[PDB]
């Protein structure tokens, strides 16, 4: 910092009303040119590489600039020099990251690992101005790779500025996770978000957001408007119907320490049974969710039998389905 | 919450008397499909019901073990496996010891007392499969737990809700005891049983076996065009 | 906790509300890591934290107004909402410690009084309730869990109404289920009937004519309030009427009777059970808190039992019994009435004569106690019967006739030590000021009948002085005169018999053992009456119930005073003579050496007080046991009149162990101080320990006595020395290393040199561990050798506000300093003759390299210090020791030359005021100050940090003016060259030392520095070296 | 309760390693494997995780190479022919391998196997066999990193009318989905097995032309 | 991939007994420190850390007493063998490769707890002529021309490598041995009843006799003449 006096110290931490003062130590002018410089050379670099092999990568200029990048990103982000390093992410570290995570056998040449970093970099001590514009960022062409990247930097967050975020930044981050269950492109992003989602959900309180939750996924689960014939095609071929098994699995998953057991519960894993009943990924992931909920509650299942009549307890018998099960 | 200090290992007793490790492998059953068996005077059957995924096969549930004999299994695949070379071992034994076919009570006799000695062992396990075992003419239907018990029953059903069937059984036992001389009308019966445990679901010629066996008929099993109902 | 609004509050509960439920999971017991203690700690910390808060806030509240910020019943309810299924989790942890740190709250809930307790009371009963149906069978931890959370919350379910009906049925479940297999669950079982009954009356409250039963009454009501409760409603919904009051007290305090039969049994079982101490004690007290819980018909009854079962059972029959389980509550019986004193005294006696009759003792077994001793037992009734007669006992010659007896016809060293301590049971009796009742409501109290379930321990009237009138025992002239009639009898008789002994010695083992029998009867007839002792004899504040008297004109006036001294006067002289015979007889004895060494240690420790008993175990209630049940903090002194009984006692002891036994050594007491230092340096291990200890504790006792010792011990050394006598030489090097004496030494300038020499002379002898014993001494000496220093940077504020309006105390303290100055200059005198000494035998012999690397450290610990004078003859021989080529001894080297000339600097730097050394104003010649608030300063700054030319300062160590702001004064170096404004000796001393920096010293030291040097540690002390050679060639000292 | 849950720890073998695709059609099965991409002077022929049983019998592995199995199959095959004179069952071969399993139950042993094979019985055969001692018959099969979603275009394309060369591209286009692209001929290696030729491993030169005709037929 | 228990076993060796071996142009000098005394153990244990595996071959001990004379045994064994077997003495460095092996081997399979004992080995053969060995729990096994063992090991490899040559005598080395002894014991001065010797020479007439092992007079003779 080198302030002239504590005077102007002072009065420089006190202008913004809201008690958070200026960052302990800031970038001038001629190193953060420089830095955006050295970013903007090597997006501009990016023609030299459209149709070469990994052997013909690793030797270009383009390449060594992007290890040297990394290299240095990856020491700022490593103690002492953390706080200097956040202005980058929106702009310049988590997209370049990101274009690196394409590049598979390149980095497994050069013995790089993009992926821990950018999940990693979710615990930085960022504070309330990048929460927002981070947020936006995340929230928003990707690969499937790419998407489960942000996915999984997104639960890091949440779990790093839980009590942080408004409830607009929440709601935000809620609907991206949503919009990620419904994903017409790849299936382990849609797991993913599942997970994602009942992570989110465990930490509501009112019960309001939970019941409009529960409503909006089993609107779509109601089996009177279908017969088992068509229940099965579904199970296969149905992308919002796996969207809102995925979802509801994941309310009913938020919830493994209940005691007493609320009574949707039971309603829900009766909805979800039929669905169990049947063949396809809709099948599984309600098989994988009546397990889950079956091995967190062994050690009350004595007490919690009482929630569920005989028709309910028989229903959730056969969901482990495995080879050296006959 | 509610931990229990006494279902470690098969050598410890719970202080109300209870073996929580054979508890346990029983209720394994469950995870199993539904499996049902009968029995009339002169014949008896098995009917059964997993597929991984459309570009599968299908589990076998049904096991030969001799020519007059056979079974059908619920549970573990490996015990039952394990327990049906057992059976055909002592079979041919008792063909070629003394050329006499084994009786069906002498095979349950057998099941019960290997699987009793893993119940006292320690550092092994108990069997997690349950098995319905049919044999020759007259006809005998065993049940068989892994606790080491077996039964001799007209007719039952086990796994993967089988109640259904069961109570079925239970009530038309007086129409289903007595149809000597008709195979086809007991198979079909037994195929209403294991339709009486089916959630909505139908039944195919791909995931229906059945198993028959009575006087001068040897131990026969259908599977797919067989099992169309002909 | 305190950014919490009472007006104001939604947002903040919100908060906690969310912060709760981020927390739920990772409290489950099923997930266990890094984060379960700090889970446990915050948890335990806000709601304590809480906790003060709020007494803090009724406390100001209750002396005027309420203001808005203070905490409301609301801010009560929504913490108990909130941390609701935290604790409950908390409690099924695998770890006892976070297990005990999550249950610990509820007293913290329940003490702020919410609305919302009922939640907390019905889960607790419930779990208690299923936990002794053995509903919890396959699972321990819950069933210890239930029975932690309802011990906590004992003392506030006891002051509800409804839940009062269910504590005496409980007590009576938890009183049958005692073990005898599980010791834990009995240690559990044990803390809940004592938290039970420390809040209860442990009488009959139901009237004349009510015809009211538990039966009928209390088990209905239970019954349909644990059903309800259980059914899934909580207790707001329990309406009731009066008649719960018929199945309140009327009918749940008549079943005590069969709760203490059965209580009694199962005492009498664990007698014959293998315990743990601590558990013991624990039992003897919830024994010792259910008798004084009770009146007098349930008393009666209780003693009435105990004595039955006491004398008709079938337990000792292990070789190993709990006799105290039994014992221990007998006397306490006889603590509240001494009236059953007699009779029951009397049938002990009769019954110790019938052991001696079919022949128990007649066996020697001195190893251990046989299972032939049944006698034993009542032996030890006796012992604590007879600790509490008070005066009940003037059957005195009877008593006094079967001590006679006892002593006279039996002979068992394990038995001799249990019976020498009925006389100082009797004489301690006798003369002991001390409490004698202690119960929670006295017999003639003027408290209703219906206000005592809880002991008033939240009531004001607990701190009245009618329900606060303590019974104590104050000892009369009868008591006194009785006591001096035994104490006489008792020494007269083991005199002459001792005496009998000695005059036709023998050396078998029944000689031995009546010898050591009457040693210990002589030693506990000293510790009995040890209150009637005067320490101050020969020649306050705190003045305790002494019987003489105080000041000293009453003493004076009493003849038993002196007649009690000439008797302790006479048994000093008889325990030197049997010394003396000891000695001169049976040298090659132990266990007699033993027996008198404690009786020299009781003799010299017991001048008006007793401390060998008074941290035993007894028939007392522990104030540290009973503090902690009834202990609640911020809360002031929730306490019964048990509680506040026992504090008075305690607080009377303590002021009775308070005075000062320090005194000069009269003829006798010098004399047995030289016997037992004689017996200190033996040659058994046996003996010399025990005398070691014997002669700390008579050290402590008296004034001086360290001179003494060290005057004897030095000519003993040097004889042992002389004559070869390696064993004395070690057992006086084993002396020598006692912790006191040892730090005494550090500070003897008189006779440290003698002591050094005679260590010097102990290296050169190698036969046993003697060498490196000595070694061990010697580098102690030199860590911790204390150097007078003569500075004292003080300010005048210390001691002007203590300054008597006196012309005459200037005169005084002038005296004192300069008197202290002249003392401390020859102190320092003494010290460098000391190294001149030493410097003069380095020189002088060739020797050792252990006693070399002794004498550099030495003389580099005298030199390196600021008020010695340096010297060139000690820079020249710590120079000249690189020709005996050890590696050790050439680091030692160079560490000395470079803190001689650090000293030699610092006194240039500070010229020749040492006080600098300390002045924080003070900075040497060549450190500038700059003044870095000026405009233009940063500039400056940056421009001298790029100035390689021509600086203007320098900033050697790390620098940190500046880094965030300018302002204040920075420290900098000048660039110009440093000079050394030296006097004659120091530049002497400075050229001498340069004089022997020749090329080969250098070669040789680098050499030995490279050769002994097989790893990269590189070292700093070498570039410090490096420096002082380059300052000494830059000075001219240097050639 | 209790249950075996290693078992089913052992099964998740999604991230076991780099995926294996199978495809069995009337004319052949086809396996292909992803080839790791190591230093370019290290020799890659030294990474084979497609394995000949014998003649009529191909294994594909995820994990690591490093055996026991692999050399049981040889053993019991060679064993079979020399006490029958005639091949061992592609499903006798893999029952004989989840007996080896079982025998060396509550512990797993060993990794997944895809084994292919022909035989006179059944034709071309297809199985996948688990570390739990069980196997299932497969019409085509994913395992290893991407399982999930190469599973779903197995089902989405498999039709049972498909031909050796279009089993060939099929693998090679989910490799390719699976890996994102970027696999000219070192990230991929195919196998066949016929009944005529029997086990093959394709060299890299047929592998670069079936990249080549896969390129061509997206550019359609 | 550090092993812990072999960490133990030398920081436990560390505390024990100083062995010296020096290596001379014409013969081997062994010499070991004595620390425990009593004033009734008797110090005639045949020879409490210098022993004998054959004719040729001598070893000094440093560490624990039960494990030394298993190993001690089992070198004797494996000596009589290749002499039985080939007709001619075993090789100093296949026997210590043999004992090295024997260790490691202790130092990998669980349930055994690795010999903590460190071993100085003095040879001769006709390969390499006189030969020093030293071996330690690990199972490593290094030549040398001065090494020392025990207690003070670093202060004794400093005093070594300041006065050692490589052209010294037998009497230079058995001097060399005494002084550093006596300059790095913590028992003020040495004496003959806490030290034991041994040299290995070979003479002008090629007998070899390398199995002499100093007696308590002739320790104190040596002692006398070199002034310590």
Do not use: A, L, P
């Given at each position: 910092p080198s302030i002239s006096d504590p005077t102007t110290l002072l009065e420089a931490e006190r202008n913004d009303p809201d008690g958070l003062g200026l960052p302990l130590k800031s970038v001038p002018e001629k190193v953060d040119a420089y830095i955006k410089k050295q970013f903007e050379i090597i997006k501009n670099l990016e023609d030299s590489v459209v149709g070469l092999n990994p052997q013909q990568f690793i030797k270009t200029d383009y390449f060594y600039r992007t290890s040297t990048i990394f290299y240095w990103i990856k020491e700022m982000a490593r103690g002492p020099n953390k706080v200097l390093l956040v202005p980058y992410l929106v702009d310049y570290v988590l997209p370049f990251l990101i274009g690196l995570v394409k590049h598979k056998d390149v980095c497994a040449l050069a013995s790089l690992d993009p992926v821990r970093l950018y999940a990693g970099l979710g615990y930085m001590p960022i504070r309330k101005n990048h929460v927002a514009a981070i947020v936006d960022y995340v929230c928003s062409a990707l690969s499937s790779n790419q998407t489960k990247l942000q996915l999984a930097f997104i639960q890091h967050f949440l779990s790093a500025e839980l009590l942080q975020l408004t409830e607009e930044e929440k709601n935000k981050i809620l609907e991206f996770v949503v919009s990620n269950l419904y994903n017409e492109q790849f299936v382990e992003v849609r797991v993913r978000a599942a997970s994602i989602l009942s992570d989110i959900v465990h930490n509501w309180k009112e019960e309001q957001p939970l019941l409009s939750l529960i409503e909006r996924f089993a609107k779509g689960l109601d089996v009177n408007k279908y017969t088992s014939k068509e229940r099965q095609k579904l199970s296969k071929t149905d992308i919002k119907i796996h969207g809102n098994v995925l979802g509801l699995g994941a309310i009913i998953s938020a919830f493994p320490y209940v005691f007493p057991l609320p009574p949707w519960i039971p309603k829900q894993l009766s909805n979800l049974s039929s669905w169990a009943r049947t063949s396809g990924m809709t099948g599984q992931a309600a098989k994988n969710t009546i397990s889950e909920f079956k091995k967190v509650r062994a050690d009350t299942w004595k007490f919690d039998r009482a929630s569920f009549n005989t028709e309910e307890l028989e229903d959730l018998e056969g969901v482990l389905w495995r080879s050296y099960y006959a | 919450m509610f931990r229990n200090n006494y279902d470690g290992d098969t050598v410890t007793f719970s202080p109300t008397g209870r073996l929580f490790q054979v508890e346990y492998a029983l209720e394994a059953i469950k995870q199993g499909s539904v499996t049902v068996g009968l029995r009339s005077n002169t014949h008896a059957v098995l009917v059964a019901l997993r597929n991984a995924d459309e570009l599968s096969s299908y589990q076998k549930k049904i096991i030969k073990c001799d020519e007059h004999m056979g079974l059908s299994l619920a549970g573990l695949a490996p015990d039952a496996r394990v327990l049906s070379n057992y059976l055909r071992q002592q079979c041919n034994y008792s063909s070629l010891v003394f050329n006499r076919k084994l009786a069906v009570e002498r095979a349950g006799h057998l099941l019960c007392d290997k699987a009793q000695k893993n119940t006292q062992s320690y550092g092994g396990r108990p069997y997690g499969v349950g098995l319905l075992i049919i044999g020759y003419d007259g006809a005998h239907l065993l049940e068989f737990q892994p606790s080491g018990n077996v039964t001799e029953l007209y007719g039952t059903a086990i796994g993967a809700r089988s109640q259904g069937a069961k109570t079925y059984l239970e009530r038309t036992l007086d129409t289903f005891i007595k149809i000597d001389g008709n195979p086809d009308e007991l198979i079909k019966a037994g195929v209403e049983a294991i339709s009486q445990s089916l959630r909505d679901e139908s039944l195919t010629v791909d995931n229906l076996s059945i198993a028959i066996v009575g006087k001068d008929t040897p131990f026969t099993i259908y599977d797919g065009e067989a099992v169309a109902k002909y | 906790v305190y950014a919490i609004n009472g007006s104001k509050k939604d947002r903040f509960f919100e908060k906690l509300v969310s912060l709760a439920k981020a927390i739920e999971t990772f409290i489950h017991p099923s997930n266990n890591g890094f984060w379960t203690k700090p889970n446990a700690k915050f948890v335990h910390a806000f709601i304590k934290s809480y906790h003060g808060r709020v007494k803090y806030e009724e406390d100001i509240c209750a002396r005027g107004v309420t203001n808005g910020i203070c905490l409301t019943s609301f801010c009560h309810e929504e913490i108990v909402e909130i941390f609701l299924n935290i604790i409950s989790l908390g409690?099924?942890?695998?770890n006892p410690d976070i297990a005990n740190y999550y249950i610990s709250c509820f007293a913290y809930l329940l003490e702020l009084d919410p609305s919302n307790a009922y939640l907390i009371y019905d889960k607790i009963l419930i779990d208690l309730y299923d936990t002794l149906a053995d509903q919890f069978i396959n699972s321990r931890h819950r069933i210890i869990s239930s029975l932690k959370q309802f011990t906590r919350v004992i003392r506030f379910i006891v002051m509800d109404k409804l839940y009062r009906v269910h504590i005496t049925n409980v007590l009576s479940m938890l009183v049958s289920k005692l073990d005898m297999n599980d010791t834990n669950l009995t240690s559990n079982l044990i803390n809940g009937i004592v938290s039970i009954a420390a809040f209860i009356p442990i009488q009959d409250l139901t009237g004349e004519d009510d015809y009211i039963s538990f039966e009928s009454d209390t088990l209905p009501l239970v019954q349909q309030h644990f059903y309800h409760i259980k059914c899934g409603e909580s207790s707001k919904t329990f309406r009731v009427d009066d008649e719960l009051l018929n199945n309140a007290f009327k009918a749940s305090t008549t079943v005590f009777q069969s709760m203490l039969k059965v209580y009694v049994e199962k005492i009498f079982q664990l007698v014959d059970v293998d315990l743990e101490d601590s558990l013991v004690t624990k039992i003897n007290q919830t024994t010792m808190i259910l008798q004084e819980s009770m009146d007098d018909k349930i008393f009666n009854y209780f003693a009435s039992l105990l004595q039955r079962n006491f004398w008709s059972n079938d337990s000792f029959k292990e070789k190993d019994p709990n006799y105290e389980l039994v014992t221990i509550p007998l006397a306490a019986l006889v603590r509240r009435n001494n009236g059953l004193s007699k009779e029951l005294v009397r049938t002990l006696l009769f019954h110790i004569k019938e052991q001696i009759k079919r022949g128990a003792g007649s066996v020697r077994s001195t190893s251990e106690i046989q299972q032939?001793?049944?006698k034993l037992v009542l032996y030890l009734t006796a012992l604590n019967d007879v600790l509490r007669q008070c005066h009940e006992s003037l059957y005195s010659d009877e008593l006094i006739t079967f001590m006679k007896y006892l002593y006279d016809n039996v002979t068992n060293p394990p038995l001799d030590v249990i019976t020498s301590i009925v006389i100082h049971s009797a004489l301690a009796t006798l003369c002991t000021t001390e409490i004698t009742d202690c119960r929670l409501f006295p017999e003639d109290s003027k408290i209703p009948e219906k206000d005592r379930w809880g002991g008033l321990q939240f009531d004001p009237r607990r701190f009245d002085k009618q329900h606060l009138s303590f019974q104590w025992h104050v000892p009369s002239s009868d008591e006194i005169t009785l006591s001096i009639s035994i104490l006489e009898s008792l020494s007269e008789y083991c005199i002459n018999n001792v005496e009998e002994l000695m005059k036709a010695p023998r050396h078998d083992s029944e000689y031995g053992d009546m010898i050591q029998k009457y040693v210990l009867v002589m030693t506990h007839t000293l510790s009995g009456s040890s209150l009637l002792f005067d320490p101050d004899f020969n020649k306050d504040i705190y003045t305790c119930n002494y019987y003489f008297g105080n000041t000293t004109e009453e003493k004076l006036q009493n003849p038993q005073y002196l007649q009690v001294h000439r008797v302790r006067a006479r048994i000093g002289h008889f325990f030197h003579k049997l010394y003396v015979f000891l000695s001169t007889n049976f040298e090659n004895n132990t266990n007699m050496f033993q027996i008198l060494l404690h009786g020299l240690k009781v003799w010299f420790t017991d001048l008006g007080q007793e401390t060998v008993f008074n941290e035993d175990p007894n028939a007392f209630i522990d104030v540290d046991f009973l503090e902690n049940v009834q202990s609640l903090s911020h809360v002031n002194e929730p306490f019964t009149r048990t509680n506040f009984a026992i504090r008075a006692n305690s607080l009377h002891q303590s002021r009775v162990l308070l005075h000062s036994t320090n005194r000069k050594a009269s003829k006798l007491e010098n004399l047995l101080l030289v016997d037992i230092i004689q017996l200190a340096t033996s040659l058994y291990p046996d003996i010399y320990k025990p005398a070691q200890g014997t002669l700390v504790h008579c050290m402590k006792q008296l004034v001086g006595s360290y001179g003494v010792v060290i005057n004897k011990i030095i000519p003993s050394l040097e004889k042992a020395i002389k004559d070869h006598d390696y064993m004395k030489i070690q057992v006086i090097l084993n002396v020598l290393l006692i912790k006191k004496i040892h730090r005494k030494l550090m500070t003897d300038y008189k006779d440290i040199g003698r002591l050094i020499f005679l260590l010097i002379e102990c290296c050169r002898v190698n036969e046993l561990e003697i060498g490196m014993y000595a070694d061990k001494i010697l580098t102690d000496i030199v860590i911790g050798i204390k150097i007078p220093s003569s500075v004292c940077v003080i300010s005048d504020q210390a001691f002007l506000p203590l300054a008597p309006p006196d012309g005459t105390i200037n005169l005084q303290v002038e005296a004192v300093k300069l008197a202290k100055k002249k003392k401390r200059e020859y102190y320092l005198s003494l010290l460098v003759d000391l190294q001149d000494k030493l410097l003069d035998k380095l020189d002088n012999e060739k020797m050792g390299w252990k006693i070399r690397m002794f004498i550099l450290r030495f003389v580099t610990q005298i030199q390196s210090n600021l008020e010695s004078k340096p010297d060139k003859r000690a820079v020249f021989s710590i120079i000249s020791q690189i020709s005996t080529k050890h590696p050790e001894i050439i680091h030692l080297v160079v560490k000395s030359l470079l803190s001689t000339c650090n000293k030699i600097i610092s006194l240039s730097d500070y010229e020749y005021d040492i006080t600098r050394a300390y002045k924080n104003e003070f900075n040497p010649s060549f450190v500038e100050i700059l003044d870095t608030s000026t405009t233009s300063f940063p500039k400056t700054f940056t421009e001298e940090m790029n100035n390689f030319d021509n600086p203007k300062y320098f900033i050697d160590l790390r620098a940190y003016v500046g880094w965030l702001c300018w302002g204040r004064l920075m420290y900098v170096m000048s660039p110009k060259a440093l000079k050394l404004n030296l006097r004659e000796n120091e530049l002497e001393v400075l050229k001498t030392a340069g004089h022997l920096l020749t090329r080969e010293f250098l070669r040789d030291v680098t050499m030995n520095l490279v050769q002994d040097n097989e790893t990269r540690g590189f070292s700093s002390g070498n570039v410090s070296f490096f420096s002082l050679v380059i300052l000494l060639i830059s000075s001219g000292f240097c050639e | 309760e209790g249950r075996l849950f290693q078992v089913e720890y052992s099964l998740e073998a999604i991230k076991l390693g780099s995926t294996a695709i199978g495809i069995a059609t009337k004319e052949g099965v086809v396996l292909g494997v992803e080839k790791r991409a190591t230093s370019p002077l290290l020799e890659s022929d030294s990474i084979e995780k497609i394995v000949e049983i014998d003649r009529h019998i191909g294994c594909a592995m995820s994990g690591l190479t490093a055996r026991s199995m692999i050399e049981h199959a040889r053993t019991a095959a060679v064993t079979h022919n020399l006490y029958y004179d005639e091949d061992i069952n592609v499903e006798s071969l893999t029952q004989s391998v989840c007996d080896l399993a079982l025998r060396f139950m509550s512990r797993p042993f060993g990794v997944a196997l895809l084994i292919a094979g022909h035989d006179a019985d059944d034709g071309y055969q297809l199985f996948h066999a688990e570390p739990s001692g069980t196997f299932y018959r497969y019409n085509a099969k994913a395992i290893g990193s991407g399982s999930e979603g190469a599973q779903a275009e197995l089902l989405n394309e498999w039709h049972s009318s498909l031909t050796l060369k279009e089993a060939e591209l099929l693998v090679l286009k989910i490799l390719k989905q699976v890996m994102e692209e970027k696999l000219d001929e070192n990230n991929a290696q195919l196998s066949c097995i016929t009944k005529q030729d029997g086990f093959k491993i394709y060299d890299n030169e047929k592998t670069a032309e079936l990249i080549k005709e896969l390129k061509e037929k997206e550019a359609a | 991939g550090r092993l812990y228990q072999v960490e133990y076993a030398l920081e436990s060796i560390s505390h024990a007994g100083t062995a010296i071996g020096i290596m001379a142009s014409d013969g081997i000098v062994l010499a070991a420190e004595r620390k425990v005394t009593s004033t009734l153990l008797e110090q005639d244990t045949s020879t409490e850390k210098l022993y004998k595996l054959n004719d040729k071959i001598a070893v000094a001990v440093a560490g624990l007493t039960a494990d030394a004379e298993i190993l001690i045994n089992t070198a004797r064994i494996h000596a009589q063998n290749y002499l039985k077997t080939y007709n001619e003495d075993i090789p100093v460095e296949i026997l210590v490769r043999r004992l090295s092996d024997i260790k490691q081997g202790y130092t990998q399979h669980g349930g055994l707890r690795p010999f903590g004992v460190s071993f100085i080995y003095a040879g001769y053969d006709d390969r390499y002529g006189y030969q020093l060995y030293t071996s330690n729990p690990s199972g490593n096994y290094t030549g040398w021309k001065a090494i020392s063992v025990g207690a003070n090991t670093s202060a004794a490899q400093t005093l070594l490598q300041m006065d050692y040559k490589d052209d010294m005598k037998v009497d230079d080395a058995i001097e060399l041995a005494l002084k550093t002894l006596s300059k790095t014991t913590d028992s003020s001065a040495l004496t003959y009843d806490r030290l034991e010797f041994a040299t290995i020479r070979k003479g002008a007439?090629?007998?070899?006799?390398?199995?002499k092992i100093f007696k308590p007079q002739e320790i104190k003779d040596i002692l006398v003449k070199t002034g310590i």
């Open positions: - | - | 409690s099924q942890n695998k032939r001793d049944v | - | 007439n090629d007998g070899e006799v390398y199995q």
